[PDB]
Amino acid sequence: APQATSSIQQSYNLNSTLKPPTVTPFDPSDAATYNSSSSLGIYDSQGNSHTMSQFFIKNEPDPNATPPIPENSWTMKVLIDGVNPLDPSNKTPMSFNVTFDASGQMTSVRAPDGSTSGPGFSIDATTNVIQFSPATGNPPTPGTGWIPAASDGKTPPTYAWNGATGAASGISFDMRKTTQYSTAFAQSNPIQDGYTT
């Protein structure tokens, strides 16, 4: 039998030289709206391939924001197959804030409101590991966890639940050792535990 992805380990260097994009808002099809992006392959319960994408956007510091944006703050946006992991009927990404200390070492991964939880996930405040929660319901209930999706192929295409699930535990996403140095955006070779066929 195939095996769904339940665990992903991947670290990044986020390029400390890059300014916030001037083109706004974020659009995954327009590289002028984000600074850097990466993708990796994951698998659902039936072994079908899916592509998880991360988009990284530098945040401008702002003491007046709700919550305030510090120095060395980035937004990470997550899509799977280009659509909302939690709801294939839209393209709302899962958004996280990633911060670094003055020496460019990662200090926190949080929801945009600063807390350790949001729709479809919780984060361990100590390790900064994101636990994407497993979707509930059958058919899976939008907003509860990853809903493996497939396109009909039309233009514009409509994505819908493909009949498969994720892993029973959801997805652990571990970006520890991520760094924010004056060097190119880079990603480690992803380690993930799903497989096909």
How far apart (Å, rounded) are the C-alpha atoms in residues 74 and 59? 5
Under DSSP, is residue 161 helix (H, G, I), strand (E, B) or coil? strand
State the architecture of 7-191 in CATH terms: Sandwich (2.60)
Resolution limit, Å: 1.8
φ/ψ of 186, rounded to 5, equals -150, 155
Asked how this structure was determined, the answer is X-ray
Count CB atoms within 10 A of the CB of residue 36: 21
How far apart (Å, rounded) are the C-alpha atoms in residues 87 and 146? 8
Q: With contact defined as beta carbons under 8 Å apart, do 175 and 109 qualify?
A: yes
Residue 66: C-alpha distances to residues 62, 70, 129, 130, 157 (Å): 9, 11, 23, 22, 35
β-bridge mates for residue 80, sequence order: 52, 83
Residue 66's Cβ-count burial label (10 Å; 0-12, 13-18, 19+) is: exposed
